[PDB]
Amino acid sequence: TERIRNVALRSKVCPAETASELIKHGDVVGTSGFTGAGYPKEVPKALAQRMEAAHDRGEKYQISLITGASTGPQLDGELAKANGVYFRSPFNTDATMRNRINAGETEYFDNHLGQVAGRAVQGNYGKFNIALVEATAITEDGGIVPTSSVGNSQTFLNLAEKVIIEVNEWQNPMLEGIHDIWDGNVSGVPTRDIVPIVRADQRVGGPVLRVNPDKIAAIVRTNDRDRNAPFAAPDETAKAIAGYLLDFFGHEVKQNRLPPSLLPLQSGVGNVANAVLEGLKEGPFENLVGYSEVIQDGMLAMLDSGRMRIASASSFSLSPEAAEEINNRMDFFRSKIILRQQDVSNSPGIIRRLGCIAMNGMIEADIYGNVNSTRVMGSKMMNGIGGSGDFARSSYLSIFLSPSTAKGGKISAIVPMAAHVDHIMQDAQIFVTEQGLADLRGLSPVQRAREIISKCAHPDYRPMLQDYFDRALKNSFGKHTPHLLTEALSWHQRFIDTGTMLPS
Amino acid sequence: TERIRNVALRSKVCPAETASELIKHGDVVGTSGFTGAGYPKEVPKALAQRMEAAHDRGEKYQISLITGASTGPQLDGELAKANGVYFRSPFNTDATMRNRINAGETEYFDNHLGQVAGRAVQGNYGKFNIALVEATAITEDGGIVPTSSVGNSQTFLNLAEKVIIEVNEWQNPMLEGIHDIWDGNVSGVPTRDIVPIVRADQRVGGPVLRVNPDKIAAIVRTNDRDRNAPFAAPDETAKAIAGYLLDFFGHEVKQNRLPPSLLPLQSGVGNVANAVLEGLKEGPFENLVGYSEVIQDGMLAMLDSGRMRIASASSFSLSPEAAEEINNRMDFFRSKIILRQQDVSNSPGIIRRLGCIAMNGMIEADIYGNVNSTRVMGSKMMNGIGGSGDFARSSYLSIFLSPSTAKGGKISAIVPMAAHVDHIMQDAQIFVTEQGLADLRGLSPVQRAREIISKCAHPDYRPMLQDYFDRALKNSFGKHTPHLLTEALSWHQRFIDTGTMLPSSLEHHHHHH
Numbered sequence A: 001t002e003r004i005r006n007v008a009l010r011s012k013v014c015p016a017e018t019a020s021e022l023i024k025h026g027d028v029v030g031t032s033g034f035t036g037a038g039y040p041k042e043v044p045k046a047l048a049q050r051m052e053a054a055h056d057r058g059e060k061y062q063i064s065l066i067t068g069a070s071t072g073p074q075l076d077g078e079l080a081k082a083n084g085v086y087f088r089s090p091f092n093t094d095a096t097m098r099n100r101i102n103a104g105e106t107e108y109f110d111n112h113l114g115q116v117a118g119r120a121v122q123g124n125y126g127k128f129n130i131a132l133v134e135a136t137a138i139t140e141d142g143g144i145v146p147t148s149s150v151g152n153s154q155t156f157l158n159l160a161e162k163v164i165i166e167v168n169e170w171q172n173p174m175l176e177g178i179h180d181i182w183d184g185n186v187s188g189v190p191t192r193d194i195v196p197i198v199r200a201d202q203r204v205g206g207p208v209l210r211v212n213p214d215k216i217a218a219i220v221r222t223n224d225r226d227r228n229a230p231f232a233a234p235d236e237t238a239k240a241i242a243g244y245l246l247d248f249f250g251h252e253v254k255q256n257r258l259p260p261s262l263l264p265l266q267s268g269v270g271n272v273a274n275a276v277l278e279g280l281k282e283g284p285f286e287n288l289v290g291y292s293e294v295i296q297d298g299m300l301a302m303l304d305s306g307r308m309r310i311a312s313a314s315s316f317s318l319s320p321e322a323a324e325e326i327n328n329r330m331d332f333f334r335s336k337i338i339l340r341q342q343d344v345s346n347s348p349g350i351i352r353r354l355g356c357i358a359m360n361g362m363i364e365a366d367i368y369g370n371v372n373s374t375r376v377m378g379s380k381m382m383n384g385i386g387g388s389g390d391f392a393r394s395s396y397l398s399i400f401l402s403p404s405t406a407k408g409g410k411i412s413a414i415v416p417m418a419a420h421v422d423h424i425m426q427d428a429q430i431f432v433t434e435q436g437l438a439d440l441r442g443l444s445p446v447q448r449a450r451e452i453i454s455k456c457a458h459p460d461y462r463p464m465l466q467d468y469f470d471r472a473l474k475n476s477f478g479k480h481t482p483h484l485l486t487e488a489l490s491w492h493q494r495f496i497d498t499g500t501m502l503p504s
Numbered sequence B: 001t002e003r004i005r006n007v008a009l010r011s012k013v014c015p016a017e018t019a020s021e022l023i024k025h026g027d028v029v030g031t032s033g034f035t036g037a038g039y040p041k042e043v044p045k046a047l048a049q050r051m052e053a054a055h056d057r058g059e060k061y062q063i064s065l066i067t068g069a070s071t072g073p074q075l076d077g078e079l080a081k082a083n084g085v086y087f088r089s090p091f092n093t094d095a096t097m098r099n100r101i102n103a104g105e106t107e108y109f110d111n112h113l114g115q116v117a118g119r120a121v122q123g124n125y126g127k128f129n130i131a132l133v134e135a136t137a138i139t140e141d142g143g144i145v146p147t148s149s150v151g152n153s154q155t156f157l158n159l160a161e162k163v164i165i166e167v168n169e170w171q172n173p174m175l176e177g178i179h180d181i182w183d184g185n186v187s188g189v190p191t192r193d194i195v196p197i198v199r200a201d202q203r204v205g206g207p208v209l210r211v212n213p214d215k216i217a218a219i220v221r222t223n224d225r226d227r228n229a230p231f232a233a234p235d236e237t238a239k240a241i242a243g244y245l246l247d248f249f250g251h252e253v254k255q256n257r258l259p260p261s262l263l264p265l266q267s268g269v270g271n272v273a274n275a276v277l278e279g280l281k282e283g284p285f286e287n288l289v290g291y292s293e294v295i296q297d298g299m300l301a302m303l304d305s306g307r308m309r310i311a312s313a314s315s316f317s318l319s320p321e322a323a324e325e326i327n328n329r330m331d332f333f334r335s336k337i338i339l340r341q342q343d344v345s346n347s348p349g350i351i352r353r354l355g356c357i358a359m360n361g362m363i364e365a366d367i368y369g370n371v372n373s374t375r376v377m378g379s380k381m382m383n384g385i386g387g388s389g390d391f392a393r394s395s396y397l398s399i400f401l402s403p404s405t406a407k408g409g410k411i412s413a414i415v416p417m418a419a420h421v422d423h424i425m426q427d428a429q430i431f432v433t434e435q436g437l438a439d440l441r442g443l444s445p446v447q448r449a450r451e452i453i454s455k456c457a458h459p460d461y462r463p464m465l466q467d468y469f470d471r472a473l474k475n476s477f478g479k480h481t482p483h484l485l486t487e488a489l490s491w492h493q494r495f496i497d498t499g500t501m502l503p504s505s506l507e508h509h510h511h512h513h
Ligand SMILES: CC(C)(COP(=O)(O)OP(=O)(O)OC[C@H]1O[C@@H](n2cnc3c(N)ncnc32)[C@H](O)[C@@H]1OP(=O)(O)O)[C@@H](O)C(=O)NCCC(=O)NCCS
Pocket: A267, A268, A269, A270, A271, A272, A273, A293, A294, A360, A361, A362, A363, A364, A373, A374, A376, A382, A383, A384, A385, A386, A387, A388, A403, A405, A406, A407, A411, A412, A413
């Protein structure tokens, strides 16, 4: 079945190489792509090849690359390999690009995901020269059907001087209809419109991205794959975490602090998320609803088993097994999933209104419950803040989940002071490790410390943490949030120096 | 005239002392009060006396005190002097209470102001035993007219088992009508209502707080003043800061990145805020709008001149002279001002929709532009985060303003690493000091550092900052946000040990060579 259904636009089909020539040194390029899904593939590869050649000839050739969130080898990977990105935002997970970022070779800023569209419209990244967006199809009326994510694509299409569409035959034609694109003012010039979403399952828009056809400078026919999540399963640590959390949800429901169906759920991806979602798949809470950034393996299973009724997100993050699954029953799943613009999925106004329960991972927390989501030792980027701030601060309950240690026990995930802060105390109420659960609601910082140390810290590190806290209480400048500044970051330095946070 | 216009409720009138006896050791008490305005006065004073008397006999007597925001000497002050508060939230500016907090004698958590009502309804502070609310009047149908602030009063009235009202004749009767109290679900059980505010001058509710009259256990007639802090006349440092900011606004307008009427403005109080408000009064702008937490002297000034068309807030923060001005013209100013519940003034949904410009103070920022609003040396509370997070994160533009140094030059307000973080890099776009303005939009952390160091840091500290940065760039574990963990917090420790962040020349320092 022909994917370009608007006859007139078929005259704009051209090779990826030729399309890449539209992109000039210095350009700001906005692309589709979120959680390894729906990013352009072939034009970035052709661009990277030409960048390498240009550099070899002594010609500067770099772009600014703005996305939905993470992409894949074909985009972040190839461009990073070619040393062709001078600035990157807002969220990366590619190893080559991560290395460029941590070497200072590519400038990076990890904006709150739900804010990126608004900052782009404000001009913070500069004028968008190019929008490069992957599509499942182009409708007879010229609508652009998104692929496996929506992300920021509608905004990039609005802003960009020239538009390049990659129509990817690898993507399932039955994706058409799954997206919900609102034509209102979410991230434009103030005063913005009210987004009339009052339930997580509410569609308020249409199935296509809109663009003036005169702005389309090239369409490239492509055939290449998204990334997939690991198939791998929850270990003992993840299952213990899930166990503590589910017990907690049970007690809240019993105390009438949550409905029997809980509240709209926001979850991450990873061992821990899968375990939590796996836990819920067979849990005592029925008619669950998801209002999240991403559809992962865990949520897909519940939409399947009816334990979750519907899930809202901006993107997919699926294992090959899960992808195969959904691609076989798209007609079914398509009625249980809504893919929204990321400035809507991650809108704090909507998240607070719906009363979302936020469940997110973390690098580390300190004893006062400040959370680092991003920067190892305070300086080395992992992925980025993503939407964890959008959700943590706006949620009805903000929960953070992590193994109590990292790197085979050589790092404590509970530390005297976080080496970098992404989420302040006020934005984190509940902590869960395989050691236990700390409920911090209504507590002062010293009271938070008692709970975090006693409930969440690993036995190998707990006495050291308690020792730090007790001596801090005695010798700190102030006693409201006791610290010993000579020692606060010393565990991190110990790891840098010796490879472990444990004393010799 | 009679302030209690509901006849039945007059039977509940009693002395302050008697009313205070309703409050028991251990009680959670929610009160009116925000930026030193509209807090109860006589009952707290009586309570403090009875607490001190109990303590002298070896009898425990303490409460949990939950407020709108800051109060005043009669409340935070008296209770703190009496050591009568075991837990306090969400925001304090009283010096005695500050001392109790920093000594560990009063447990404290500074919640985001716009979230307090919601967390109270969720039960985070426990069950509310008492709501103690100051009123201008009580209407014929039993409505409670608030005074110089709204704060969290409607929420506290809903939650509390027993209610005590202080009817304060010092407060101008013409305050009645200035408030907008919504019965909508802003901070209740999900799903919440859409709060349908689409302009700063929009009223969505009515003039009174609502309470079941059966919960009213006591009404006390009072006559006592709010805490009207002296006007902080701008110094040269403040004027310089304001000048840079106003130049920046002017440029944004000339580049069509803001309209000539700017956008709804949120500002603070004090020296720098006053300088900015004076600058706004004289600048090349028109038809300004306030959407903030507070109404300050400079705002009245622009409402009078017509430069500002309306000012929305939860409270007043006026000097005695300004308080006098508004009292003799309350008829006029009541038409230009809307006082809202703080969970509405500080609603992230509304702040973002309106596109507010946020302008806030700070203790310090690090070279990467993370901001500390609260904890000196990382451990000693000043005031609290207040609504700075509500506004900073939700705003169209988030701006932080501060002198480049503190403590007569012995502290740098720009440091290698902040000792505590309230506002992450993502929540701060513009920094201004008397040295200049750093525009950080679209920059990576290393690029942020270049701008902050060059534009904002004091000449006495810039070389030391550049040295830290340069050596971090060469040695840091990662180079995305370069740090030297061995010395990141060393300037703070230096201040603790020596009373200054400036290094001695009797030992080696990398920037000296
Ligand atoms: C924090 C985050 C990296 C954790 O991911 P996770 O899969 O749940 O946790 P894991 O235990 O598997 O650890 C992931 C990686 O971080 C590393 N890590 C985790 N904690 C660490 C620590 N305290 N010190 C050093 N490294 C750490 C792990 O080593 C691992 O890296 P590796 O494979 O190179 O060894 C991840 O949640 C994230 O990037 N958060 C930011 C975005 C976000 O939260 N968005 C909201 C929801 S869409």
